[PDB]
Amino acid sequence: CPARYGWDYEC
Amino acid sequence: GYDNREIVMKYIHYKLSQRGYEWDESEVVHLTLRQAVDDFSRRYRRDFAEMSSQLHLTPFTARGRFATVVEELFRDGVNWGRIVAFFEFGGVMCVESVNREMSPLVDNIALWMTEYLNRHLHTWIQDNGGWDAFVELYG
Structure with a gap:
């Protein structure tokens, strides 16, 4: 998904 | 095999015990969740704080x-x-x-988390390698 949290960049 | 309700309740049970409150496999998944939350607490503390704010x-x-x-x-x-x-x-x-004298809400929160997992998260987990995919990395 659109990264809105730091953990989104790992996924 | 696991039970989503068992996982939610072990996690909440653990987090309450951390702060000195007594309330009332799925175990391996609960332990995986503790490892992952600990990990994210060292790297995404601002994001956790911003969600818990308000x-x-x-x-x-x-x-x-x-x-x-x-x-x-x-x-x-x-x-x-x-x-x-x-x-x-x-x-x-x-x-x-519990801190604010609203301890009846704990089991409601466990229910809302269980329903939300089951209705909105479970199919994604199943389509993306199950809980095993997660346990494999953080277990």
Whole structure:
């Protein structure tokens, strides 16, 4: 998904 | 095999015990969640703090506060980092409920987390390698 949290960049 | 309700309740049970409160495999998954929340606490503390901010809790606003946070978390998709954050958020809500003399809300929060997992998260988990995919990395 659109990264809105730091953990989104790992996924 | 696991039970989503068992996982939610072990996690909440653990987080309450951390803060000195006594309430009342799925175990391996609960332990995986603790490892992942610990990991994220060292790297995404600002994101955890920003989600837990604006938690002004009253029994008649508890559900609406839960729904707003969790619906914003997953509105444009589900990933494993958002599942970790969902657990952290529900745990924090449970300990804040006890700190503010609203201990009846703990089992409601466990129910809202269980329904939300089952209705909105479970199919994504199953389509993306099951709980095993997560346990494999953090177990």
